[PDB]
Symmetry: C4
Amino acid sequence: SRPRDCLDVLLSGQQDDGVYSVFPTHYPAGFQVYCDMRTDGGGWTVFQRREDGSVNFFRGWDAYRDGFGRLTGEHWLGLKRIHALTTQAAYELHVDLEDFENGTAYARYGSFGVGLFSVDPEEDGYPLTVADYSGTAGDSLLKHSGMRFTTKDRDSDHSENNCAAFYRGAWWYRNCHTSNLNGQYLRGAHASYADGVEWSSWTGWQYSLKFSEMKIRPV
Amino acid sequence: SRPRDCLDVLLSGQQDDGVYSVFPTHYPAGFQVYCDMRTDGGGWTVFQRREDGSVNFFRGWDAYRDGFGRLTGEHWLGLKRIHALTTQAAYELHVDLEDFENGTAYARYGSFGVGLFSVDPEEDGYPLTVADYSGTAGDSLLKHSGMRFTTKDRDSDHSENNCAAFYRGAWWYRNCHTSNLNGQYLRGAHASYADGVEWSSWTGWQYSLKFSEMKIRPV
Amino acid sequence: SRPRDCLDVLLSGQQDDGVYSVFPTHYPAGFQVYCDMRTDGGGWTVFQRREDGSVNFFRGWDAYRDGFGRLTGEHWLGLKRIHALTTQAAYELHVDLEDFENGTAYARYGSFGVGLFSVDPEEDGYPLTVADYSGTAGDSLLKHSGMRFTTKDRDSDHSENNCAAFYRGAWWYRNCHTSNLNGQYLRGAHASYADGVEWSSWTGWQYSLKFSEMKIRPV
Amino acid sequence: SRPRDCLDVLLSGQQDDGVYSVFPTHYPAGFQVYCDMRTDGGGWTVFQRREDGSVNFFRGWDAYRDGFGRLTGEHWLGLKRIHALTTQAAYELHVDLEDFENGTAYARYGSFGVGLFSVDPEEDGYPLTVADYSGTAGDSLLKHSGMRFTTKDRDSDHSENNCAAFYRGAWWYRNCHTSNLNGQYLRGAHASYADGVEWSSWTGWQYSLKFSEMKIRPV
Ligand SMILES: *[C@@H]1O[C@H](CO)[C@@H](O)[C@H](O[C@@H]2O[C@@H](C)[C@@H](O)[C@@H](O)[C@@H]2O)[C@H]1NC(C)=O
Ligand SMILES: *[C@@H]1O[C@H](CO)[C@@H](O)[C@H](O[C@@H]2O[C@@H](C)[C@@H](O)[C@@H](O)[C@@H]2O)[C@H]1NC(C)=O
Ligand SMILES: *[C@@H]1O[C@H](CO)[C@@H](O)[C@H](O[C@@H]2O[C@@H](C)[C@@H](O)[C@@H](O)[C@@H]2O)[C@H]1NC(C)=O
Ligand SMILES: *[C@@H]1O[C@H](CO)[C@@H](O)[C@H](O[C@@H]2O[C@@H](C)[C@@H](O)[C@@H](O)[C@@H]2O)[C@H]1NC(C)=O
Ligand SMILES: CC(=O)N[C@@H]1[C@@H](O)[C@H](O)[C@@H](CO)O[C@H]1O
Ligand SMILES: CC(=O)N[C@@H]1[C@@H](O)[C@H](O)[C@@H](CO)O[C@H]1O
Ligand SMILES: CC(=O)N[C@@H]1[C@@H](O)[C@H](O)[C@@H](CO)O[C@H]1O
Ligand SMILES: CC(=O)N[C@@H]1[C@@H](O)[C@H](O)[C@@H](CO)O[C@H]1O
Ligand SMILES: [Ca+2]
Ligand SMILES: [Ca+2]
Ligand SMILES: [Ca+2]
Ligand SMILES: [Ca+2]
């Protein structure tokens, strides 16, 4: 009756993809999420989806903290929810990607968390833990490990300017990125540099992907 | 001991209309509501009542989010509470209406929700889900399906101006309305256009109804 | 283990006056209170105490909502806590009073609540329910029944000016008062009109009492 | 499954130092802490650590209320968390100290709390309860007993100026201190007066200690 994530939902006998209530250890009010019950046996809690450019992702700090969009479409679950999920157990991250020629690729990370040891994860900038790459998309996240989350209105990156402003996104920017999945929905090849839905190791710095899904499952 | 709504209250053996504590899945602190234990077998959770013009309904965003008035009289339960109720199960909506000549009518909607898949229902504007009309008042809500909630100080409608300002209410306005049950208590026929307690399919756009009650029950 | 008030604390076998954790129905985090386990068999939850003038009571809205002072001395528990207590069951109010000549008196009210049916008790001004006087101090509260709570920075009274500013207190003021137990600690007879710790039916409008305690118990 | 502190964690069979979830009586959402399972049998909940000067401690009121830094390194758990822990039972305080010549000392206090009887511990300034010194570092805290917590942006001390501003820290300042463990990480002997990580009874007023840990355990 109180699953902590989509894997508890699956193991309780819910096999269909869709929206479910989950109740993280330190977020006992709980909230709804999209559960992927198909990928590698299922039990994945979605926290990011791009598929059509219907939702504005060029949002400030409060929106990235609290979440935006709809669970059934393009959304960002919110860093306060991603923190509550990833601190309650050891999670892996799965990233699904699709181009406009219906090509697909994925990146799996054996460890993933946000603000794991932060007393105030919001003040500390929800810093990224990520390690142990495998898959077909190539690694575009390991260089972001240890970076705080940066938005157009709150700069915690390693750049003289604001990486989020410059690359029209919100991410764990260093100086600045190898991945930008919260970037502008520019729809494939673009002249502007690295400011779309980029996964540089698969499609480079001038190709805005059609589809992205970021999702977590206990190791 | 922890009913989720007025139907749980009724099925627990409370048969009297009145104020009860309910505890929605994602609002575990709970809150008090007015329960209608008579209509079509009872178990209806009230979220809106007009009966006398004693309460100001021309209120801003925060008041429509948090609720106002009194459970025993004219009130609005608050969109944060209506969201918590309608996302925890599939609800139907019942609307009771009365004119100043003691005529009555009702509208039943087989599905009703507010912000059903919204990650942040407040930021997303508590959008309306409504379908499957039946009853005697005629349908004045189906055209509002998919619209965000608009107040005098927060415009999310499909109009060049603010529908809430123009029609002195707060509603899931398109451009602008077929219903306005949070409109001014103008007391029957009025010269001003559509800015009273209107249900256009029953009494048209220049008749402010005497009584309205909006209430929900699990399908 | 989760008493809802000081009467649950007493009936659980705690017989000593002092500070205890209580957990009201709609405030499940709970909070600490002073329990009077002596008066008329005990089980009284204190929400107001004056005894020495050590604490400033001439405070604004936020302080009267959230509480101030110390449970072991002069304090105001806070209208958000008094609301959570008095809406969860039917309470009686006991008021103990002492003058500077060690005279004592009390007022008992068979029913007492704050914001009982208010959807947003804070927006609605935590209105007073009180009835059924008995005791030795005389009735100085029944005329306040139905009034909202007024502070120096938030006027909801029936006066052309601010009763809280004028009588240097915070109360369910009409125009303006018969009681002012949150008034200035002026220490007995005073020239200034009605701006001390007044209980007019016992000591009139120019006598600031030495001691007051307001406390509640389920009927 | 719901330990209230690190002693419950230890007695449940967790013997390793590290980060654990705890759930104080009036903070049922819970939070993570560093548990010291070694000192005097173990079961100590850490709330302060200095070890390297990597974290800025010269922070304002909100940061001292909410916490900052990382549980695995330098941090301050936050006065709202320290209040929730120390009001739920009778705690003792242990302070470990180390100089830059690898000398160590400790101070044990048989009673310790923050805002113990405060209705609003934040408004009341999270006042210190401390008594019953023993150990090797000497007593540098008893003179602070009864003082409110003071930061650069919120002065509650007994000084004509702001003790936190003057001594570049945050503490239960009187006029001004015998201890300053949230002071500047100045690294040993310094010319500036008393504005480093000072424990005056061990190393005087011009020696910024290398290491400090403040931690609590039920008496
Ligand atoms: C990519 O997959 C989608 C969804 O499964 C397909 O609809 C696309 O097929 C193309 O578009 C459809 C509507 C139809 O015209 C078909 O003949 C096309 O091949 C598919 N391919 C591309 C290039 O988008
Ligand atoms: C509508 O119903 C109400 C409530 O049941 C009635 O009180 C009204 O009756 C009218 O008003 C009462 C006070 C009395 O004068 C009676 O003779 C009237 O018919 C009733 N009718 C209307 C038109 O409001
Ligand atoms: C009122 O009661 C208090 C507390 O029980 C007493 O202390 C007072 O007694 C008076 O003050 C004490 C200190 C002592 O001087 C005694 O002889 C006095 O009678 C008591 N009376 C008054 C008038 O305050
Ligand atoms: C203090 O303790 C630390 C940690 O246990 C030691 O590393 C220090 O030893 C000194 O530094 C190391 C790196 C090595 O050079 C050794 O030979 C030194 O004695 C130790 N001493 C001091 C003075 O910091
Ligand atoms: C999108 C992005 O961060 N791109 C480049 C990075 O590849 C490059 O190595 C660096 C050199 O300074 O400049 C960054 O802006
Ligand atoms: C109250 C309301 O929305 N009324 C009218 C609507 O019936 C009409 O079809 C439309 C034409 O533009 O103009 C709206 O303002
Ligand atoms: C303290 C207080 O409210 N006193 C008086 C009240 O007794 C009096 O009847 C009234 C007449 O207008 O004026 C009020 O101010
Ligand atoms: C750091 C600190 O508080 N030091 C001194 C204190 O030792 C001294 O007794 C006092 C005299 O006024 O002045 C304080 O500032
Ligand atoms: Ca920068
Ligand atoms: Ca508009
Ligand atoms: Ca007034
Ligand atoms: Ca000062």
